[PDB]
């Protein structure tokens, strides 16, 4: 398996599977999961209400020192309750390392804003408000960022069109750039894709 | 206390943005796929999918294309379970319709009964 | 092999020519309808039959790489010439 | 239990004796991956794609064929079995013909994906490749034998399904080919599901030929209406348009098969369409008008009727929402004249209690019964996967057929009783020998088609057959949760018509004749303007001008069952739904949102607004309308018969013949497969 | 060496083939060989027959072989080419 | 292509052309398929 | 059926915090007319912000309402700064968009919408 | 003006229909024979409530309640509602 397969990195695996244990261990009141990908990733799945301790933790603890907040995201998973989940992701300069913290909300529950960790986060969550709808809460201005100003709905949620609901063109009538219900002259072609066949046994869920 | 007792349905219609001729006249259908009957494979009908119901595709004077005025025509969500198909439809105010799971049920195979001695399950040829 | 519709419309080599009530013909009013004269169906048909002297042909259109994937015709039926389903030249065993 | 533990993977399962490996391997979700096993046909075990190593055993075993030893690790996942797999993938593909571009199996095809999925990514077959020659068996089935891989599903379709027998492998080894030997012509009625189950493009379909592709294809499920066995299917359309008709599986019903007609007869609905309002002018000619002067021009007649100057016939592919809705607005004239083209015989019980005009046992319920009684039907075209059903337990069950009608081809042997309905009689008093069969069975089955109530005496047929299900059903050793009476509708829209209270036939228009008529989407001729009085306003509804367009004074465009979501209720009983595929075309509406807008105009308007108002009031007048994918049991079979004792009606000395002897008047029964020309060249295919 | 049929006017369904009565009782013979319900086991030997008859296997002998069975006509056609004792062309 | 000339082809064009948008030669988009759904015509002769 | 608040502990400081929105628009709504330099009147603007709060007058959720004030907070935020322009503001005045059939009839009429 | 026709819904199997059933299996025969061009359009599915419909003239449809009726309360119904004619 040498020339076409990316090589594992076991030393890398080890290591952040120790800091892991080391992280779930040290804050068990709101680490739920702690698992590493095997192209050496670690993930830390934390309760929501520890999204300040668990992070201040990360940036200030000597072991860790996570100084940097790389990105911070979130994925709409419409088959969960909770069917937003936020990702942090954060570097480590001093050990060279990047840890990802997930956690999760619905429509309704507010997230502790970690502005007050890092303020780089100031934009994201922003971004996760537009996109999303996700509200955080003790954000210094909590707004839109990206959507126009009177757009109504969250585009990156799955159930959100790609599409929207409405589009903009210039009417000479009202001399005015006017917002109506789109129309497409050609509709986006939908491709059902995805072979019948299972391509990764690996990842096979059990059946009912 | 830091928690709050909410016994109402939940309902988020008024905050997703979705303008209400696409909330009340639309019929969400939950169904796990049939499989293509072309292909011998499973895999797509794994999973429950909610999909709308197609409205006027007409066409572009222009060159022919298919225009639509429906912007949930190609919206198709995947859930992994029946229950939290019908909880996102309710949740989103859609009125909704669910087929059952059609599995297929199980076959008595034997290869010998190819070559009974005085059923009529043998085979004329192979 | 172009033709011509009554309407004066040329009818191209899918056979489309919008019909005399039809008011999408304003579009080429002033202007012209672009048409490619040389009609594939017809140019295909002016390309002798290869005699082959073997049972099963290959055929990739010609320019090795630069024709199309290389498929295997079989020439039993005498009555019907055998049809590359990529270029459409066609064979015939020579017995 | 007497389940033995096997194992996949090393996770346990219980598993019957007698499964296979591939089963015990599907029981944990584990897709074996295969060419010729198909669950439906008979194991073959020559493809050898499903090898699996059993650990401990130093062979690999075909999974589709070998039974499961207990104890047996199957290890579908390890190097030798991914080894087998790329082996035999590599052989599938070292003659198999580049033609992926140009192939229409592209993007659904088995070979293709698992290729990808099980096979290596190149080759190593360095030599030149077979070529076949193709076949002809039809203007169905595009033969394209180079791309054959040899598995058989073909012949074992055919001979074990289709009951045929006319496939088949010649020659040997590599020059092995599958055809027919002769230049014949393989036209079943379920000759296209050898393009469904063929797992290559060696076989695909020649009205659907080249024109789409799979990815692009959105999938609408969806409901046949071409007979009343009300098959699953898919309408896969593609920018708005109909590309091809696929089934659906559904266990009960179609198990995973279609008829021929199902599957081809949609390019007539794209052709001889309804699409705008017609009035006739003052020349009497139809001429192109809007929905407001032809819904006005309906409805100012409508004002001047009342009571029997109203009649209504509804016609073959109607929907239970259009028939409610047409039934409300008669009602609203106080007019109880809404006949169907289908006779039925109201003696007795009539369509009161639901179980004497059904299929009482079910589709399934063939598969329990030991003796059929088939009086005169010919369902290997009436109902051809009811035919199939009961093929299938002809094959594998010992089921005894008996058949009282005109010698028909079934696709399996069956006992002729003869064609004369006194034998209905003969059995019935214990006088003929299949009496004692009748009574020594344990699940009798008595199938009445509904085409033989056609008759004049069709009162006395079904008095006839009933007396023998209630001779058998009330003395033998019949349980009592086994039904004996059934009857087989061949109309998509009888059963929802009579559990609506319809009156079945048309004998209450000649009997006293309107002066307005309404037909939706009678095309069957049953009533012409001989009938009615010297200037009846005749308004046809529908999708299609074909017998009562020509005659009508105002056309109503109408929805098709692709066109329209529509309760449809199969001979069965089972209410079922289409979904819109796509849109009724020009100015053609939903049937029910035309008779509702002709309401308004008329100053009656119903009570509904939206389809799931229809379905309530669909609800009230009988509540398992909308009820789907359920089969609702009907009781009172004894009080339908001591009804049916009440008039003595006499048997006709006609012999039993259904409608329909050959497969040359399958293909033609209603509006849109006389529209098809594909029907057209399969009808021309087989007179020949 | 093709394994279709075509028909030419020396090979073809009108292609005038009968056994001999004395071939008939070999036939009968060939048939009493095998249990009841098996009938389709005289298929190799009567066809074989036919070809002793004839000296070879026009497309009628494959017709009669297939009537005098009872078995379908492309199971005497899978068998006419598997084998390659069948003489197909004289 | 004085030292090197083109491959001849019978389809490829003798006379080339300059860009022609807004003269009477430009290009005009059109559907080049045919009609899809054919109406039902109704009987020429009268119905009584 | 314990869930987390957004700012109202119940229905009665969320029907507070929607009547100082409404106040705080209904202020509004003057100067919107005069710096954006509108074609509508006060009074007609106003009519647009009670349409607006009565539309959402059904909810019963304090969560639901909350982010609705949170909302409307945000496209109050952004009327008096100006970073919408007036073609943000007249968007609420669906001007340009036809009148939609409302009856059966004309919907039979104009298409195959319910 | 009069009665059109009849609508009887009732279960299969739930006890609340039990007595409608006993309407059936007894006295349904004479009723048809008693009225033999009205339709009593039996209907029975599977969790339904029991219920008599009755069409009138022009469209009038009344509705009565069949739920833990007994025979002869079905019985009385029935013939409140052939009697009634209204
Ligand atoms: C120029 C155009 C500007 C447009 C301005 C758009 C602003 C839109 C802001 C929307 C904010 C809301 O709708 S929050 C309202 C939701 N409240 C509820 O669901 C609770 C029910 N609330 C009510 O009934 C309200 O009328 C009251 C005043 C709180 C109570 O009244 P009831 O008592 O009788
Ligand atoms: S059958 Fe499958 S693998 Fe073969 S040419 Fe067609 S798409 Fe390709
Ligand atoms: S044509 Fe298709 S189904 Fe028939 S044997 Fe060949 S690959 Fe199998
Ligand atoms: S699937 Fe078992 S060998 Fe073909
Ligand atoms: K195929
Ligand atoms: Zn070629």
């Given at each position: 398996?040498?020339?076409?397969?990316?090589?594992?990195?076991?030393?890398?695996?080890?290591?952040?599977?120790?800091?892991?244990?080391?992280?779930?261990?040290?804050?068990?009141?709101?680490?739920?999961?702690?698992?590493?990908?095997?192209?050496?990733?670690?993930?830390?799945?934390?309760?929501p209400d520890?999204?300040?301790?668990?992070?201040?933790?990360?940036?200030?603890?000597?072991?860790?020192?996570?100084?940097?907040?790389?990105?911070?995201?979130?994925?709409?998973?419409?088959?969960?309750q909770n069917?937003?989940?936020?990702?942090?992701?954060?570097?480590?300069?001093?050990?060279?390392?990047?840890?990802?913290?997930?956690?999760?909300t619905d429509e309704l529950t507010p997230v502790?804003?970690?502005?007050?960790?890092?303020?780089?986060?100031?934009?994201?969550?922003?971004?996760?408000?537009?996109?999303?709808?996700?509200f955080?809460?003790?954000?210094?201005?909590?707004?839109?960022?990206?959507?126009?100003?009177?757009?109504?709905?969250?585009?990156?949620?799955?159930?959100?069109?790609?599409?929207?609901?409405?589009?903009?063109?210039?009417?000479?009538?009202?001399?005015?750039?006017?917002?109506?219900?789109?129309?497409?002259?050609?509709?986006?072609?939908?491709?059902?894709?995805?072979?019948?066949?299972?391509?990764?046994?690996?990842?096979?869920?059990?059946?009912? | 206390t830091q928690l709050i007792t909410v016994d109402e349905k939940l309902?988020i219609?008024?905050?997703?943005?979705?303008?209400?001729?696409?909330?009340?006249?639309?019929?969400?259908?939950?169904?796990?796929?049939?499989?293509?009957?072309?292909?011998?494979?499973?895999?797509?009908?794994?999973?429950?999918?909610?999909?709308?119901?197609?409205?006027?595709?007409?066409?572009?004077?222009?060159?022919?294309?298919?225009?639509?005025?429906?912007?949930?025509?190609?919206?198709?969500?995947?859930?992994?379970?029946?229950?939290?198909?019908?909880?996102?439809?309710?949740?989103?105010?859609?009125?909704?319709?669910?087929?059952?799971?059609?599995?297929?049920?199980?076959?008595?195979?034997?290869?010998?009964?190819?070559?009974?001695?005085?059923?009529?399950?043998?085979?004329?040829?192979? | 092999?172009?033709?011509?519709?009554?309407?004066?419309?040329?009818?191209?080599?899918?056979?489309?020519?919008?019909?005399?009530?039809?008011?999408?013909?304003?579009?080429?009013?002033?202007?012209?309808?672009?048409?490619?004269?040389?009609?594939?169906?017809?140019?295909?048909?002016?390309?002798?039959?290869?005699?082959?002297?073997?049972?099963?042909?290959?055929?990739?259109?010609?320019?090795?790489?630069?024709?199309?994937?290389?498929?295997?015709?079989?020439?039993?039926?005498?009555?019907?010439?055998?049809?590359?389903?990529?270029?459409?030249?066609?064979?015939?065993?020579?017995? | 239990?007497?389940?033995?533990?096997?194992?996949?993977?090393?996770?346990?399962?219980?598993?019957?004796?007698?499964?296979?490996?591939?089963?015990?391997?599907?029981?944990?979700?584990?897709?074996?991956?295969?060419?010729?096993?198909?669950?439906?046909?008979?194991?073959?075990?020559?493809?050898?794609?499903?090898?699996?190593?059993?650990?401990?055993?130093?062979?690999?075993?075909?999974?589709?064929?070998?039974?499961?030893?207990?104890?047996?690790?199957?290890?579908?996942?390890?190097?030798?079995?991914?080894?087998?797999?790329?082996?035999?993938?590599?052989?599938?593909?070292?003659?198999?013909?580049?033609?992926?571009?140009?192939?229409?199996?592209?993007?659904?095809?088995?070979?293709?994906?698992?290729?990808?999925?099980?096979?290596?990514?190149?080759?190593?077959?360095?030599?030149?490749?077979?070529?076949?020659?193709?076949?002809?068996?039809?203007?169905?089935?595009?033969?394209?034998?180079?791309?054959?891989?040899?598995?058989?599903?073909?012949?074992?379709?055919?001979?074990?399904?289709?009951?045929?027998?006319?496939?088949?492998?010649?020659?040997?080894?590599?020059?092995?080919?599958?055809?027919?030997?002769?230049?014949?012509?393989?036209?079943?009625?379920?000759?296209?599901?050898?393009?469904?189950?063929?797992?290559?493009?060696?076989?695909?379909?020649?009205?659907?030929?080249?024109?789409?592709?799979?990815?692009?294809?959105?999938?609408?499920?969806?409901?046949?209406?071409?007979?009343?066995?009300?098959?699953?299917?898919?309408?896969?359309?593609?920018?708005?348009?109909?590309?091809?008709?696929?089934?659906?599986?559904?266990?009960?019903?179609?198990?995973?098969?279609?008829?021929?007609?199902?599957?081809?007869?949609?390019?007539?609905?794209?052709?001889?369409?309804?699409?705008?309002?017609?009035?006739?002018?003052?020349?009497?000619?139809?001429?192109?008008?809007?929905?407001?002067?032809?819904?006005?021009?309906?409805?100012?007649?409508?004002?001047?009727?009342?009571?029997?100057?109203?009649?209504?016939?509804?016609?073959?592919?109607?929907?239970?929402?259009?028939?409610?809705?047409?039934?409300?607005?008669?009602?609203?004239?106080?007019?109880?004249?809404?006949?169907?083209?289908?006779?039925?015989?109201?003696?007795?019980?009539?369509?009161?209690?639901?179980?004497?005009?059904?299929?009482?046992?079910?589709?399934?319920?063939?598969?329990?019964?030991?003796?059929?009684?088939?009086?005169?039907?010919?369902?290997?075209?009436?109902?051809?996967?009811?035919?199939?059903?009961?093929?299938?337990?002809?094959?594998?069950?010992?089921?005894?057929?008996?058949?009282?009608?005109?010698?028909?081809?079934?696709?399996?042997?069956?006992?002729?009783?003869?064609?004369?309905?006194?034998?209905?009689?003969?059995?019935?008093?214990?006088?003929?020998?299949?009496?004692?069969?009748?009574?020594?069975?344990?699940?009798?089955?008595?199938?009445?088609?509904?085409?033989?109530?056609?008759?004049?005496?069709?009162?006395?047929?079904?008095?006839?057959?009933?007396?023998?299900?209630?001779?058998?059903?009330?003395?033998?050793?019949?349980?009592?949760?086994?039904?004996?009476?059934?009857?087989?509708?061949?109309?998509?829209?009888?059963?929802?018509?009579?559990?609506?209270?319809?009156?079945?036939?048309?004998?209450?228009?000649?009997?006293?004749?309107?002066?307005?008529?309404?037909?939706?989407?009678?095309?069957?001729?049953?009533?012409?303007?001989?009938?009615?009085?010297?200037?009846?306003?005749?308004?046809?509804?529908?999708?299609?001008?074909?017998?009562?367009?020509?005659?009508?004074?105002?056309?109503?465009?109408?929805?098709?069952?692709?066109?329209?979501?529509?309760?449809?209720?199969?001979?069965?009983?089972?209410?079922?739904?289409?979904?819109?595929?796509?849109?009724?075309?020009?100015?053609?509406?939903?049937?029910?949102?035309?008779?509702?807008?002709?309401?308004?105009?008329?100053?009656?308007?119903?009570?509904?607004?939206?389809?799931?108002?229809?379905?309530?009031?669909?609800?009230?007048?009988?509540?398992?309308?909308?009820?789907?994918?359920?089969?609702?049991?009907?009781?009172?079979?004894?009080?339908?018969?001591?009804?049916?004792?009440?008039?003595?009606?006499?048997?006709?000395?006609?012999?039993?013949?259904?409608?329909?002897?050959?497969?040359?008047?399958?293909?033609?029964?209603?509006?849109?497969?006389?529209?098809?020309?594909?029907?057209?060249?399969?009808?021309?295919?087989?007179?020949? | 060496?093709?394994?279709?049929?075509?028909?030419?006017?020396?090979?073809?369904?009108?292609?005038?083939?009968?056994?001999?009565?004395?071939?008939?009782?070999?036939?009968?013979?060939?048939?009493?060989?095998?249990?009841?319900?098996?009938?389709?086991?005289?298929?190799?030997?009567?066809?074989?027959?036919?070809?002793?008859?004839?000296?070879?296997?026009?497309?009628?002998?494959?017709?009669?072989?297939?009537?005098?069975?009872?078995?379908?006509?492309?199971?005497?056609?899978?068998?006419?080419?598997?084998?390659?004792?069948?003489?197909?062309?004289? | 292509?004085?030292?090197?000339?083109?491959?001849?082809?019978?389809?490829?064009?003798?006379?080339?052309?300059?860009?022609?948008?807004?003269?009477?030669?430009?290009?005009?988009?059109?559907?080049?398929?045919?009609?899809?759904?054919?109406?039902?015509?109704?009987?020429?002769?009268?119905?009584? | 059926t314990s869930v987390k608040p957004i700012f109202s502990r119940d229905?009665?400081?969320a029907?507070?915090?929607?009547?100082?929105?409404?106040?705080?628009?209904?202020?509004?709504?003057?100067?919107?007319?005069?710096?954006?330099?509108?074609?509508?009147?006060?009074?007609?603007?106003?009519?647009?912000?009670?349409?607006?709060?009565?539309?959402?007058?059904?909810?019963?959720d304090p969560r639901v309402?909350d982010l609705?004030?949170?909302?409307?907070?945000?496209?109050?935020?952004?009327?008096?700064?100006?970073?919408?322009?007036?073609?943000?503001?007249?968007?609420?005045?669906?001007?340009?968009?036809?009148?939609?059939?409302?009856?059966?009839?004309?919907?039979?009429?104009?298409?195959?919408?319910? | 003006?009069?009665?059109?026709?009849?609508?009887?819904?009732?279960?299969?199997?739930?006890?609340?229909?039990?007595?409608?059933?006993?309407?059936?299996?007894?006295?349904?025969?004479?009723?048809?024979?008693?009225?033999?061009?009205?339709?009593?359009?039996?209907?029975?599915?599977?969790?339904?409530?029991?219920?008599?419909?009755?069409?009138?003239?022009?469209?009038?449809?009344?509705?009565?309640?069949?739920?833990?009726?007994?025979?002869?309360?079905?019985?009385?119904?029935?013939?409140?509602?052939?009697?009634?004619?209204?």
């Amino acid at each position: 398996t040498r020339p076409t397969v990316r090589p594992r990195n076991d030393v890398a695996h080890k290591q952040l599977s120790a800091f892991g244990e080391y992280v779930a261990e040290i804050l068990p009141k709101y680490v739920q999961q702690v698992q590493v990908s095997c192209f050496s990733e670690l993930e830390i799945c934390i309760h929501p209400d520890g999204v300040i301790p668990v992070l201040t933790f990360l940036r200030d603890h000597s072991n860790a020192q996570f100084k940097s907040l790389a990105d911070l995201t979130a994925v709409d998973i419409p088959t969960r309750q909770n069917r937003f989940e936020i990702v942090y992701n954060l570097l480590s300069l001093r050990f060279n390392s990047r840890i990802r913290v997930k956690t999760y909300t619905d429509e309704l529950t507010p997230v502790e804003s970690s502005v007050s960790v890092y303020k780089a986060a100031n934009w994201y969550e922003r971004e996760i408000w537009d996109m999303f709808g996700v509200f955080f809460a003790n954000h210094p201005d909590l707004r839109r960022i990206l959507t126009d100003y009177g757009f109504e709905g969250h585009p990156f949620r799955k159930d959100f069109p790609l599409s929207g609901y409405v589009e903009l063109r210039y009417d000479d009538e009202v001399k005015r750039v006017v917002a109506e219900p789109v129309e497409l002259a050609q509709e986006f072609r939908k491709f059902d894709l995805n072979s019948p066949w299972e391509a990764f046994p690996a990842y096979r869920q059990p059946p009912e | 206390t830091q928690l709050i007792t909410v016994d109402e349905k939940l309902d988020i219609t008024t905050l997703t943005g979705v303008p209400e001729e696409h909330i009340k006249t639309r019929k969400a259908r939950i169904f796990v796929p049939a499989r293509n009957n072309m292909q011998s494979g499973v895999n797509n009908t794994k999973k429950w999918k909610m999909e709308f119901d197609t409205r006027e595709r007409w066409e572009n004077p222009l060159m022919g294309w298919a225009s639509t005025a429906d912007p949930l025509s190609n919206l198709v969500l995947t859930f992994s379970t029946k229950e939290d198909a019908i909880a996102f439809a309710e949740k989103n105010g859609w009125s909704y319709d669910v087929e059952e799971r059609k599995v297929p049920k199980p076959k008595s195979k034997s290869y010998g009964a190819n070559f009974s001695w005085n059923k009529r399950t043998r085979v004329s040829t192979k | 092999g172009v033709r011509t519709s009554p309407t004066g419309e040329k009818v191209t080599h899918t056979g489309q020519v919008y019909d005399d009530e039809d008011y999408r013909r304003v579009r080429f009013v002033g202007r012209q309808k672009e048409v490619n004269e040389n009609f594939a169906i017809d140019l295909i048909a002016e390309q002798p039959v290869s005699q082959v002297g073997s049972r099963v042909i290959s055929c990739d259109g010609g320019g090795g790489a630069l024709g199309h994937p290389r498929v295997y015709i079989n020439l039993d039926k005498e009555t019907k010439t055998g049809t590359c389903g990529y270029c459409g030249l066609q064979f015939r065993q020579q017995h | 239990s007497n389940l033995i533990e096997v194992f996949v993977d090393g996770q346990s399962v219980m598993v019957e004796p007698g499964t296979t490996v591939l089963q015990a391997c599907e029981k944990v979700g584990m897709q074996i991956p295969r060419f010729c096993y198909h669950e439906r046909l008979s194991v073959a075990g020559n493809c050898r794609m499903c090898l699996v190593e059993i650990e401990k055993a130093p062979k690999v075993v075909a999974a589709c064929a070998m039974p499961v030893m207990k104890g047996w690790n199957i290890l579908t996942n390890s190097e030798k079995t991914k080894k087998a797999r790329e082996g035999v993938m590599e052989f599938l593909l070292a003659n198999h013909p580049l033609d992926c571009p140009i192939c229409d199996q592209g993007g659904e095809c088995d070979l293709q994906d698992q290729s990808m999925m099980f096979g290596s990514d190149r080759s190593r077959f360095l030599e030149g490749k077979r070529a076949v020659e193709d076949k002809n068996i039809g203007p169905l089935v595009k033969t394209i034998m180079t791309r054959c891989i040899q598995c058989t599903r073909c012949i074992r379709f055919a001979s074990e399904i289709a009951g045929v027998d006319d496939l088949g492998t010649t020659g040997r080894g590599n020059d092995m080919q599958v055809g027919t030997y002769i230049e014949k012509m393989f036209m079943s009625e379920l000759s296209g599901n050898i393009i469904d189950i063929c797992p290559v493009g060696a076989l695909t379909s020649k009205p659907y030929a080249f024109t789409a592709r799979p990815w692009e294809t959105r999938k609408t499920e969806s409901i046949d209406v071409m007979d009343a066995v009300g098959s699953n299917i898919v309408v896969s359309t593609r920018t708005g348009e109909v590309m091809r008709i696929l089934p659906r599986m559904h266990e009960d019903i179609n198990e995973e098969w279609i008829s021929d007609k199902t599957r081809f007869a949609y390019d007539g609905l794209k052709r001889q369409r309804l699409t705008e309002p017609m009035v006739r002018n003052e020349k009497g000619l139809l001429t192109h008008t809007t929905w407001e002067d032809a819904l006005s021009r309906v409805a100012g007649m409508l004002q001047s009727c009342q009571g029997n100057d109203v009649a209504a016939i509804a016609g073959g592919l109607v929907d239970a929402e259009a028939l409610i809705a047409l039934k409300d607005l008669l009602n609203r004239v106080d007019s109880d004249t809404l006949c169907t083209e289908e006779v039925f015989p109201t003696a007795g019980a009539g369509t009161d209690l639901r179980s004497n005009y059904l299929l009482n046992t079910t589709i399934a319920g063939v598969e329990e019964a030991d003796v059929v009684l088939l009086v005169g039907t010919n369902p290997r075209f009436e109902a051809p996967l009811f035919n199939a059903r009961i093929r299938k337990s002809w094959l594998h069950n010992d089921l005894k057929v008996a058949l009282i009608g005109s010698p028909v081809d079934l696709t399996y042997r069956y006992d002729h009783l003869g064609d004369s309905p006194k034998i209905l009689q003969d059995i019935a008093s214990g006088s003929h020998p299949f009496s004692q069969v009748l009574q020594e069975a344990k699940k009798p089955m008595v199938v009445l088609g509904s085409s033989a109530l056609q008759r004049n005496d069709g009162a006395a047929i079904l008095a006839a057959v009933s007396n023998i299900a209630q001779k058998i059903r009330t003395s033998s050793g019949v349980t009592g949760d086994w039904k004996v009476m059934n009857i087989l509708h061949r109309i998509a829209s009888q059963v929802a018509a009579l559990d609506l209270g319809y009156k079945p036939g048309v004998e209450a228009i000649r009997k006293n004749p309107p002066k307005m008529l309404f037909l939706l989407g009678a095309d069957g001729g049953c009533v012409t303007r001989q009938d009615l009085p010297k200037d009846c306003f005749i308004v046809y509804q529908g999708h299609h001008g074909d017998v009562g367009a020509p005659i009508a004074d105002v056309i109503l465009p109408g929805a098709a069952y692709t066109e329209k979501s529509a309760t449809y209720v199969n001979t069965e009983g089972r209410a079922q739904q289409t979904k819109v595929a796509v849109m009724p075309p020009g100015l053609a509406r939903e049937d029910w949102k035309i008779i509702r807008a002709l309401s308004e105009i008329a100053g009656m308007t119903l009570p509904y607004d939206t389809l799931d108002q229809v379905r309530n009031r669909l609800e009230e007048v009988s509540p398992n309308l909308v009820r789907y994918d359920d089969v609702e049991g009907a009781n009172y079979f004894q009080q339908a018969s001591e009804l049916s004792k009440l008039v003595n009606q006499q048997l006709l000395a006609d012999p039993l013949v259904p409608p329909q002897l050959t497969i040359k008047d399958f293909y033609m029964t209603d509006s849109i497969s006389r529209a098809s020309q594909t029907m057209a060249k399969c009808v021309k295919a087989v007179t020949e | 060496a093709l394994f279709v049929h075509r028909d030419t006017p020396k090979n073809n369904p009108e292609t005038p083939f009968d056994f001999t009565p004395e071939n008939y009782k070999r036939i009968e013979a060939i048939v009493k060989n095998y249990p009841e319900g098996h009938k389709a086991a005289a298929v190799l030997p009567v066809l074989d027959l036919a070809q002793r008859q004839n000296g070879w296997l026009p497309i009628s002998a494959m017709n009669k072989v297939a009537e005098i069975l009872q078995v379908p006509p492309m199971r005497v056609y899978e068998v006419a080419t598997f084998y390659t004792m069948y003489n197909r062309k004289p | 292509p004085t030292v090197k000339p083109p491959t001849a082809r019978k389809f490829i064009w003798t006379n080339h052309k300059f860009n022609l948008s807004g003269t009477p030669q430009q290009y005009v988009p059109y559907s080049t398929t045919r009609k899809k759904i054919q109406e039902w015509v109704p009987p020429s002769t009268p119905y009584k | 059926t314990s869930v987390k608040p957004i700012f109202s502990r119940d229905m009665n400081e969320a029907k507070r915090r929607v009547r100082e929105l409404y106040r705080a628009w209904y202020r509004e709504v003057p100067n919107t007319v005069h710096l954006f330099q509108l074609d509508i009147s006060v009074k007609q603007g106003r009519d647009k912000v009670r349409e607006m709060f009565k539309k959402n007058a059904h909810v019963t959720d304090p969560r639901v309402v909350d982010l609705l004030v949170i909302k409307g907070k945000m496209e109050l935020e952004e009327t008096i700064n100006v970073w919408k322009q007036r073609t943000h503001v007249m968007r609420f005045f669906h001007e340009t968009e036809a009148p939609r059939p409302k009856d059966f009839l004309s919907k039979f009429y104009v298409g195959h919408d319910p | 003006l009069g009665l059109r026709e009849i609508r009887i819904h009732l279960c299969q199997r739930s006890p609340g229909s039990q007595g409608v059933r006993d309407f059936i299996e007894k006295r349904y025969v004479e009723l048809k024979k008693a009225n033999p061009d009205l339709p009593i359009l039996i209907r029975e599915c599977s969790d339904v409530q029991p219920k008599l419909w009755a069409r009138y003239a022009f469209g009038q449809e009344k509705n009565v309640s069949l739920n833990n009726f007994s025979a002869d309360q079905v019985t009385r119904a029935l013939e409140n509602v052939l009697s009634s004619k209204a």
